[PDB]
Amino acid sequence: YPTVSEIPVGEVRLYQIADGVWSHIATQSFDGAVYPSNGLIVRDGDELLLIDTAWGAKNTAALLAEIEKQIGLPVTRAVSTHFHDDRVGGVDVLRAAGVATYASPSTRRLAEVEGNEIPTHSLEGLSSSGDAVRFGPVELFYPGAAHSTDNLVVYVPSASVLYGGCAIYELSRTSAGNVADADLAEWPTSIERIQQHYPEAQFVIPGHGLPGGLDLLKHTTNVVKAHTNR
Numbered sequence: 001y002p003t004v005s006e007i008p009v010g011e012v013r014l015y016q017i018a019d020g021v022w023s024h025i026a027t028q029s030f031d032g033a034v035y036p037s038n039g040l041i042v043r044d045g046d047e048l049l050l051i052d053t054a055w056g057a058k059n060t061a062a063l064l065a066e067i068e069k070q071i072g073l074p075v076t077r078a079v080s081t082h083f084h085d086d087r088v089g090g091v092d093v094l095r096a097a098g099v100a101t102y103a104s105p106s107t108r109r110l111a112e113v114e115g116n117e118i119p120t121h122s123l124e125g126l127s128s129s130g131d132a133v134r135f136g137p138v139e140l141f142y143p144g145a146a147h148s149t150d151n152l153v154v155y156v157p158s159a160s161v162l163y164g165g166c167a168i169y170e171l172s173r174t175s176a177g178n179v180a181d182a183d184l185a186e187w188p189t190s191i192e193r194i195q196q197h198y199p200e201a202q203f204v205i206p207g208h209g210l211p212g213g214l215d216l217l218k219h220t221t222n223v224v225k226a227h228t229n230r
């Protein structure tokens, strides 16, 4: 799996998880440190569905170029899983390229208030904790407030891939990440909704870092509970 040390600045790598399912990996500086960040690509017939930008306009242009080089099918729709820049930063690049960009109404509102890029289309049916909707080759799920109040997770039923976004931490992360907009009180309950809804998931992708199994959900709960008590 691609890591920071393998990814030059402004570049994107793809990792094929299953037939027609990839993660995309980019890097970005934040407060002087370099972070990896993951999104998803899911084949949708002879088109592609993109989950999340690559954390900025430059990275997202590089993402589109790497998709063309390695896959060669058009990205027609994109979903942003919450309102922060690792998820919507680059939406303007996607829109200018002809991609239809989507997010929940909650995410669109929070992005506008925060001054971040705003996906065009609104995803209905995701406003109450536990809600799920189909979107092409994926299911979108709103587990409740966690890393952010609007965070969605994405499941690929054909491949048993669960993309947790920033609500799910990689195993190497043993203290809180960016929690400025987090709901610490609800985060473990929201993770439990994910576990209860996707107990069949085989391949779990965090917002940042290395994939794993469903152990990443318990790990994230452990870290979040420890932070609550600290």
Ligand SMILES: O=C(O)c1c(F)ccc2c1O[B-](O)(O)[C@@H]1C[C@H]21
Pocket: 030, 035, 084, 085, 086, 087, 166, 176, 177, 178, 179, 207, 208
């Ligand atoms: O997900 C994280 O915990 C995370 C982090 F650890 C450092 C910086 C960021 C993070 O994600 B974010 O809150 O979505 C935002 C782009 C910034």
Ligand SMILES: [Zn+2]
Pocket: 082, 084, 085, 147, 148, 166, 178
């Ligand atoms: Zn965030």
Ligand SMILES: [Zn+2]
Pocket: 086, 166, 207, 208
């Ligand atoms: Zn993040």
Ligand SMILES: [Zn+2]
Pocket: 171, 218, 219, 220, 222
């Ligand atoms: Zn752990």
